Amino acid sequence: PKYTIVDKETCIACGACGAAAPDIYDYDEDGIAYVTLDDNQGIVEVPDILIDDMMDAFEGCPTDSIKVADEPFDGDPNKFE
Numbered sequence: 001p002k003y004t005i006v007d008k009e010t011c012i013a014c015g016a017c018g019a020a021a022p023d024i025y026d027y028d029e030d031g032i033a034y035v036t037l038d039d040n041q042g043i044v045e046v047p048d049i050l051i052d053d054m055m056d057a058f059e060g061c062p063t064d065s066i067k068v069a070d071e072p073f074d075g076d077p078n079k080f081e
């Protein structure tokens with residue numbers, strides 16, 4: 001299974017991830033990216049049909065703020081860092 005989350009401290013709100021994977025990433029009230037699947041908690045398995053879009057967003061994030069793992073983040077974008 002794959003999980004994903006945005007590090008809100010490092011996101012620079014550059015527009016890339018919503019363009020790459022709009023069914024995974026959008027922008028909060030402040031304009032900062034977040035994962036819509038689970039409100040940035042890193043607890044909903046990414047649907048099969050969205051995995052390729054996830055990969056595009058992951059590689060295309062300039063600050064490496066988008067995280068991907070085989071394990072839930074449960075609210076901590078830095079669980080694996």
Ligand code: SF4
Pocket residue numbers: 006010011012013014015016017018025033060061062063064065066
């Ligand atoms: S691609 Fe990365 S830095 Fe740009 S808005 Fe998305 S999470 Fe933030």
